[PDB]
Amino acid sequence: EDPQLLVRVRGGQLRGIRLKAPGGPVSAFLGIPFAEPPVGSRRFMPPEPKRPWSGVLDATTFQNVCYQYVDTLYPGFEGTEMWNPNRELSEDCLYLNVWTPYPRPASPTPVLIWIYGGGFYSGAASLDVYDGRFLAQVEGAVLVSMNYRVGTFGFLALPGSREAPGNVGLLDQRLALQWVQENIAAFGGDPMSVTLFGEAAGAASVGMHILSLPSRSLFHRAVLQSGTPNGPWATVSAGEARRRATLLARLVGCNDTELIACLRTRPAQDLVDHEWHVLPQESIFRFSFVPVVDGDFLSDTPEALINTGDFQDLQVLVGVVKDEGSYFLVYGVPGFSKDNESLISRAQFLAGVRIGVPQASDLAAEAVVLHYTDWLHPEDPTHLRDAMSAVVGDHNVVCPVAQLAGRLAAQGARVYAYIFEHRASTLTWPLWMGVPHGYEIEFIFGLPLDPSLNYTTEERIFAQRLMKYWTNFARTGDPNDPRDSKSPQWPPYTTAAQQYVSLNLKPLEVRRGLRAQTCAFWNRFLPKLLSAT
Amino acid sequence: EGREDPQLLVRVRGGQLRGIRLKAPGGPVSAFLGIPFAEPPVGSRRFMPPEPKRPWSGVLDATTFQNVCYQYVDTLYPGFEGTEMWNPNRELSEDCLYLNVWTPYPRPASPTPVLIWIYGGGFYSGAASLDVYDGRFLAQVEGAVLVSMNYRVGTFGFLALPGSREAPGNVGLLDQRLALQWVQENIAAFGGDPMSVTLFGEAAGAASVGMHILSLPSRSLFHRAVLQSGTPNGPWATVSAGEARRRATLLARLVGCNDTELIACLRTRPAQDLVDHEWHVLPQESIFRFSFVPVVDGDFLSDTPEALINTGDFQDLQVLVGVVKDEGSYFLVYGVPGFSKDNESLISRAQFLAGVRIGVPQASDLAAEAVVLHYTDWLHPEDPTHLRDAMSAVVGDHNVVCPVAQLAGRLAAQGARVYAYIFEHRASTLTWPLWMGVPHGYEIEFIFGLPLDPSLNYTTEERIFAQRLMKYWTNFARTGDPNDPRDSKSPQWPPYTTAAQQYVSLNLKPLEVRRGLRAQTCAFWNRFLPKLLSA
Ligand SMILES: *[C@@H]1O[C@H](CO[C@@H]2O[C@@H](C)[C@@H](O)[C@@H](O)[C@@H]2O)[C@@H](O)[C@H](O)[C@H]1NC(C)=O
Ligand SMILES: *[C@@H]1O[C@H](CO)[C@@H](O)[C@H](O)[C@H]1NC(C)=O
Ligand SMILES: CC(=O)SCC[N+](C)(C)C
Ligand SMILES: CC(=O)SCC[N+](C)(C)C
Ligand SMILES: CC(=O)SCC[N+](C)(C)C
Ligand SMILES: CC(=O)SCC[N+](C)(C)C
Ligand SMILES: CC(=O)SCC[N+](C)(C)C
């Protein structure tokens, strides 16, 4: 019995497992329950705290993945399968994972809490790219990650109902945050220094905790990688959530109480089978069951909340990858595939814009096409393919990020911004997709430090830099190395200078203006257009 | 005759003329100035098409410039060369339909290609007698026969009650056409070749050239065309029949006046009364807009210039078109609060938004916002230097650059041989402030070769630059190709096409080929704003 692997938390005793990182051992406590299983009558309901347990709970293995849609586009292909569930699916999935140094920290250590993405319809804390051991071992970090409910199970809402009030997957996340405040000190973690970080829907989730008062007492800093609470996909209105839940019920053969009661009888896969059938248009980067503007978790729209919020005591790190949109094009836009160059016609570009900007009117779509066409090369398939990616990336991630960065800065927050421009040497998606959505994560988590994974020496050195920025941010709210001189420093993002950095194999380079002209199109003009028309 | 210079006596259809020997720097040229080409359009003839001049008896003295057509005279900056150089330099009169001819001295012995100049001035002003339109350098140095005519401007040239007999519209264009007919019949008497006539003009003169391209009876009267900083299409060069009628009717009311009865009453008014009220009829507070301009009458213009350039067959056409670096800047001090020639005109964002309503006067609120958003530098949205320069760009692009881009594209797509330039040299002697850059009109003095006159104080490099330009323009006149058929060593000027969109920089440096005439921004003005308009 290794006493470093025995911890007493409020619910009882746990036994962890010693894992081997390249530089040495780490302690892992995996599959720790933070809620009562949300099964049976508890489906669609807020999470309840986990009851205490007898004896020593085995926390040596990852628990089940929350029940979800499994991707089938490219069976056996690593680029898609690396995101698919890697443990059995179950509604009984409300567990979290903690990595710490071995031996455990002698003094209170800054905590990083990871919230995974997956469109609010997928994801798991057990994926290889979210492996917290490198950060634990190399940077001495205490790293936590939780499973939260996704799809109908996490986000189906009949707003105003007792039995399906909405946003319960976010409440799962919050309960895990409360768990950390109550228990993380037992692992050597510092509850007075907690940094949330996440990517895509996970980043949107972090943003929602920034915008919801009860969460604000549970953390001190935030990192939003490639996602935001504002923007076209992260939230729905109460009316649209109700429509979707009501249509789904209809499709599976089902007064809110009666409707929700019948949905609770349905096998989990019956719900998932119809998950994608309730979206209002044919689209990409759109997800059926997402956080809802309920007037409770979210007191108003994220747009409203970011415009009027006071963010003076907040430090935030935000950014994007170079090719945010490319991934999504193979899931809906004719002409696109991983298995060829996806050189498209102008006709295919105009068709794709309707799918990539599915809420756009004819005129708005026309403006998108006119803005993104290179009028020197208006029919060039390479330009048109790359423009399609840009439209989807900018509409869904880059311009929402720019908007958030600007508002948070204007309203007193300390903001740092980046663009991530390095394509992993071992990437299995084609060259044309560039640096796609999701492919900074393996570097931030430090995977290239494992020589068995076949990254280059330069990628290992780059990962070590990134882990340092992130953990320095965790320690101080400033990603710069506190001892260590050398220009260039990473300056805060401001509305005046709009400074951000490129994260690639070259030294930090400071740039100004995050797609400034194009995001003015999306953030200023298109709103004026559809409010008038 | 008997004691006079025998090399200056010429007969035309209306009778005998006596010209004058002028000194150009390289030698003598012949000038026949103030030749009448129409009956004076006075009295009962006001607003009416021109009638051919009746023959005269004896020798007509053609040694001086004739009257300038009655027009508004700029008072913005009294005494200032930058404005006064465009003001009338002879007596204002409605008796003004005269033309000028310059030729080598002695006159050429074999038929010589002819260049015909049509001046600009917003269709409300201008004169063929201005110093910058002096044909002596082209005639002396390039051996050109150069012709320039006065044409009626303002109400006198362009007031229309469409469908009426007494004020049918477009009479200033008909004045131009009659001068072109005069050249066909008479220019051989001077050694000019009626089978090689090239029209060239700037601003409204360029617009006029374009309307001759688009009007059937003009097409037999010339062979090639040059449009400098102006087009027949675009927001200022034409009005609809209904708008012309509205303006004519309002003007009549303002001066105290059934179309016959209305026009009869307008014919009783002093010319100056019409001039004094002509600015009062524009529908908005605006710049780069003019009250009395060509009308889409279904006659001279059978359809809008837009329609005609979209459907026309221009296979037999060769055209040279282009713009200066700062088309808009001039106009800002005539209407946009915050702008002046006597300070740097650094403006606020508020003054930029206000300016956009004045510079894009027909724009709805949404379109104006589209413009502001496009032209704002979102890295420096409040910087007064960028805002000033953006105000200029808005007005230049909207009114000249994007209309030219549109014209060059349609013409090339529909069979024309098109050559395109941007002129980027600022005259060393320019009296307008530096912030205005290379303003509208300030290429002309170089095309006409004024720097060849040492008394004018241009630089040596400016002289060499002028000589190149005159070569380009005259080579184009001669052959439909501005390139020298000898000189393969000099860089070549490629035709503008829709595929490659090539055009050249005209400056002190050897020709540089560039691609795309404001391609992205002109997509906004020419493809997006029109689609917005439809709803
Ligand atoms: C630039 O000038 C604009 C026009 O005002 C005229 O010129 C200036 C220099 C004054 O002498 C004034 O009396 C004239 O009427 C002004 O609107 C503008 O404010 C001036 N720019 C600045 C701030 O110096
Ligand atoms: C040319 O320069 C001289 C000498 O300074 C000056 O007197 C004359 O007025 C200038 N000529 C012109 C055309 O301005
Ligand atoms: C199951 C997986 O994560 S695939 C491994 C891809 N990686 C080593 C480049 C992150
Ligand atoms: C709890 C564990 O260690 S699972 C195996 C994870 N690995 C594939 C990244 C090594
Ligand atoms: C494209 C998607 O929405 S899922 C892919 C996995 N990821 C989002 C977590 C990176
Ligand atoms: C009356 C005039 O033309 S003054 C301008 C003279 N300049 C064009 C040679 C500078
Ligand atoms: C409407 C005007 O711009 S008048 C200025 C003189 N110019 C046009 C002939 C150069």
- Rounded to whole angstroms, the Cα distance separating B418 from B432 reads 32
Q: How far apart are CA A142 and CA A98, in angstroms?
A: 7
Q: Which residue of A has its CA nearest to B534?
A: A363
In angstroms, the CA B61 to CA B38 distance is 16
Q: Which residues of A touch B516 (CB under 8 A)?
A: 375-376
Residue with tokens 């980043």: A203
Interface of B with A in 490-519 (CB under 8 A): 501, 515-516, 519
- Does residue B430's CB lie within 6 angstroms of at least one atom of ligand 2? no
Ligand 6 lined by B127 (C-beta under 6 Å): no
Distance of CA A312 to the CA centre of its chain: 24
Residues of A with CB below 8 A from B524's CB?
370
Experimental determination approach used: X-ray
Handedness of CA B393, B398, B400, B403 (dihedral sign): positive
Instruction: Please count the other Cβ atoms lying within 10 Å of the Cβ belonging to residue A484.
Output: 8
Take residue A503 and report the two structure tokens written for it.
């994260």
The tokens describing A410, both together, are 């204007």
The answer to whether A19 and A133 have CB atoms below 8 angstroms apart is yes
B158 vs B120: CA distance, rounded Å: 14
d(CA B491, CA A272): 68
Give the burial string for A404-415 (b: 16+ CB within 10 Å, else e).
bbbbbbebebbb
Phi-psi label, residue A435: left if phi above 0, alpha if psi -120 to 50, beta otherwise: beta
- For residue B429, which atom of ligand 2 is closest to its CA? 14
**Of B379, B516, B519, Cβ closest to residue A513:** B379
Ligand positioned closest to the Cα atom of A446: 3
List residues near ligand 4 (CB under 6 A). A 19, 30, 62, 128, 131
Instruction: For residues A349 and A389, give the distance between their C-alpha atoms in angstroms, rounded to a whole number.
Output: 10
Nearest Cα residue to atom 4 of ligand 3: A82
Query: CA A513 to CA A410: how far, in whole Å?
Result: 15
What are the C-alpha distances in Å from B148 to residues A132, A302, A404, B41?
84, 67, 62, 18
Tell me the CB-side half-sphere exposure of residue B97, using CA atoms within 13 A. 29
- CB-based contacts of A92: which residues, under 8 Å, 6+ apart? A37, A38, A39, A64
Report the distance separating Cα A128 and Cα A83, nearest Å: 9
Q: Please, what CATH class does the domain formed by B1-535 belong to?
A: alpha beta
Number of residues in chain B: 535
A vs B, Cβ pairs < 8 A, gives: 45
Nearest one of B215, B344, B520, B187 to A375, comparing CA atoms: B520
The alpha carbon dihedral of A154, A159, A165, A167 has a sign of positive
> Quick check: helix, strand or coil at residue A341?
coil
3-state SS track over B158-183 = HCCCCCCCCCCCCHHHHHHHHHHHHH
What is the identity of the amino acid at A185? A
Closest CA to B177 of B206, B135, B207, B219: B219
Spatial strand order of the sheet with A189-199 comes to: A17-21, A24-33, A95-101, A142-146, A109-115, A189-199, A221-225, A315-321, A414-420, A499-503, A509-512
Could A521 and B373 be called an inter-chain contact, meaning their C-beta atoms sit closer than 8 Å?
yes
- How far apart, in Å, are the Cα atoms of B493 and each of A52, A447, B426, B505? 85, 57, 21, 10
Q: What angle do CA B156, B160, B166 make, to 5 degrees?
A: 85
CA nearest to A113, candidates A96, A94, A126 = A96
DSSP letter (8 states) at residue B326? B
Chain B nearest C-alpha distance from A19 (Å): 49
Task: Find, in chain B, the residue whose alpha carbon is nearest to that of A530.
Answer: B366
Among A147, A170, A164, CA closest to A68: A147
Strands B318-324 and B417-423, how do they pair? parallel
Instruction: Determine which helix (DSSP H) or strand (DSSP E) holds A134, and give its type and residue range.
Output: helix A133-139
Query: B457 CB less than 6 Å from ligand 2?
Result: yes
Q: Quick one: tokens of A135?
A: 């950060």
CA of B278 to the centre of ligand 1 (A): 27
Tokens of A191: 């509850």
Is the minimum distance from the CB of B203 to ligand 7 under 6 angstroms? Answer: yes
Nearest CA in chain A to B520: A375
Å from CA of B363 to ligand 7 middle: 23
Residues of chain A positioned with their CB less than 8 A from the CB of B376:
520
Rounded to 5, what percent of chain B is helix, strand, coil?
40, 20, 45
Beta-carbon count within 10 A of B492 CB: 13
Contact predicate A336/A433, CB 8 Å: no
CA distance B378 to chain A (A): 6
What are the CA-CA distances from residue A15 to residues A12, A30, A182, B98, B446 (Å)?
A: 10, 9, 18, 107, 90
Distance B143 CA to ligand 2 centre (A): 29
Compute the nearest-CA separation of A377 from chain B (Å).
Answer: 8
Question: Which of A26, A191, A16, A20 shows the shortest CA–CA distance to A103?
Answer: A26
Looking at all shown ligands, the one closest to residue A425's CA atom is 3
The alpha carbon of B308 is separated from its chain's Cα centroid by a whole number of angstroms, namely 20
SS3 assignment, position A417? strand
Q: Which CATH number fits domain A1-533: 3.40.640.10, 3.40.50.720, 3.40.50.1820, 1.10.1670.10?
A: 3.40.50.1820
d(CA A461, CA A468): 11
User: Are the C-beta atoms of residues A444 and A467 closer than 8 Å to each other?
Assistant: yes
- Residue B81 CB–ligand 6 contact under 6 Å: yes
Q: Which of B215, B177, B218 lies closest to B52 in space, CA to CA?
A: B177
- For residue A270, the distance in angstroms to the closest alpha carbon of chain B comes to 46
* Ligand 1 binding pocket mutation candidate from B343, B347, B436 (most atoms within 8 A of CB): B343
Cβ contact (<8 Å) for B528 and A498? no
Q: Is residue A263 within 8 Å of residue A236, measured between CB atoms?
A: no
Q: What is the DSSP letter of A129?
A: G
Candidates B353, B408, B366; CA nearest to B518 is B408
Find, among B299, B201, B178, the residue nearest to B244 by Cα: B299
Dist. CA A117–CA A447, nearest whole Å? 18
A327 CB within 6 A, ligand 5: yes
Contact (Cβ atoms closer than 8 angstroms) between residue B220 and residue B195: no
Query: Phi/psi of residue A319, each to 5°?
Result: -175, -175
Helix axis angle, B365-375 to B384-396, nearest 10°: 120
Is residue B441 in contact with ligand 7, taking CB distance under 6 Å? yes
Q: What is the DSSP letter of B46?
A: T
Find out whether A210 and A305 touch, Cβ atoms under 8 Å. Answer: no
| Strand pairing class (B417-423; B502-506) | parallel
Q: At a CB cut-off of 8 Å and minimum separation 6, what does B17 contact? A: B9, B10, B11, B32, B35, B59, B60, B62
Atom number in ligand 6 closest to CA B427? 10
**B166: helix, coil or strand?**
coil
Q: Which residues contact B345 (CB under 8 A, 6 or more apart)?
A: B332, B333, B338, B339, B388, B435
Q: Distance between CA B121 and CA B266 in Å, rounded?
A: 24
CA distance B20 to B310: 46
Distances (CA, A) of B294 to A202, B124, B165, B482: 63, 11, 17, 30
Q: How many CB atoms lie within 10 A of CB A91?
A: 17
CA distance to partner chain B, nearest, from residue A286 (Å): 28
Residue A28 near residue A98, CB atoms below 8 Å: yes
Tell me whether residues B501 and A376 touch, CB distance under 8 A.
yes
Measured CA to CA in angstroms, residue A504 lies from A129, A394, A426, A482 at distances of 19, 20, 16, 21
Distance in angstroms (rounded) separating the CA atoms of residues B281 and B274: 11
CA distances from B117 to A96, A488, B32 (A): 84, 60, 15
3-state secondary structure of A332: coil
Question: Does the beta-carbon distance from B369 to A520 stay under 8 Å?
Answer: no
Q: Which of A29, A276, A229 lies closest to A115 in space, CA to CA?
A: A229
Task: Give the residues across from B33 on adjacent strands.
Answer: B63
Q: Which of A455, A438, A234 is nearest to A326 (CA)?
A: A438
| Under 8 Å between Cβ of A107 and A140 | no
Residue having the nearest C-alpha atom to atom 2 of ligand 7: B121
Round to whole Å and give the CA distance between A510 and A499. 6
What SS3 class is residue B298?
coil
Task: Answer for the pair A454, A427: CB distance below 8 angstroms, yes or no.
Answer: no
Q: Could you tell me if B128 and B135 are in contact, meaning their C-beta atoms sit under 8 angstroms apart?
A: no
Crossing angle for the helix pair A238-251 and A256-264, to the nearest 10 degrees:
50
Ligand 7 in reach of B121 Cβ (< 6 A)? yes
Whether B519 and A367 lie within 8 Å, measured CB to CB: no
Instruction: Cis check for the bond before A488: say yes or no (omega within 30 of 0).
Output: yes
- For chain A, the residue count is 533
Question: Which resolution in angstroms does this entry have?
Answer: 2.2
| Eight-state DSSP code of residue B50 | P
Query: Which of B373, B531, B535 lies closest to A525 in CB terms?
Result: B373
Dihedral of CA atoms B386, B389, B394, B398 in degrees, nearest 10, equals: -150
Omega before B106 within 30 of 0, i.e. cis: yes
Cis peptide bond upstream of A103, omega within 30: yes
Residues 292-331 of B with CB under 8 A from A: none
Calpha distance B339→B394 (Å, rounded): 14
Nearest to A421 by CA among A508, A325, A326, A502: A502
The DSSP code for B410 is: H
Contacts of A439 (CB under 8 A, 6+ apart): A321, A423, A424, A427
How far is the alpha carbon of A374 from chain B, nearest alpha carbon, in Å?
7
Helices (H), A156-235: 168-183, 201-210, 213-216
Neighbours of A324 (CB within 10 A): 28
- Cα–ligand 1 centroid distance for B432 (angstroms): 15
Closest to A138 in 3D by CA, of A478, A470, A506:
A470
Q: Are strands B318-324 and B224-228 parallel, antiparallel or unpaired?
A: parallel
Determine the Cα–Cα distance for residues A479 and A495; give it in Å rounded to an integer. 19
Q: What is the CA radius of gyration of chain B?
A: 23
User: B378 and A516: CB-CB below 8 Å?
Assistant: yes
What is the Rg, in whole angstroms, of the alpha carbon atoms belonging to chain A?
A: 22
The whole-angstrom separation of Cα B484 and Cα B471 is: 8
